[PDB]
């Protein structure tokens, strides 16, 4: 049905491509893109998730 979530099994990394695709997590603040969100779910340890693609 209907979700959205990047998936962040992979991070967090030690680098990101500068590519801005901003991903605005449940916070309400943005994440530069699949890079600084999925960094800011992984620290999160789970509970941050992904209220819209794009920016805020």
Known sequence: L???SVDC???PK?????E???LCGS??????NK???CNAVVESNG???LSHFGKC
Do not use: H, I
């Open 2 to 4: 209907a979700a959205v």
């Open 9 to 11: 099994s992979e991070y």
């Open 14 to 18: 030690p680098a990101c491509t500068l």
């Open 20 to 22: 801005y695709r901003p």
């Open 27 to 32: 916070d309400n603040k943005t994440y530069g």
């Open 35 to 37: 890079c600084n969100f």
């Open 47 to 49: 509970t941050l998730t």
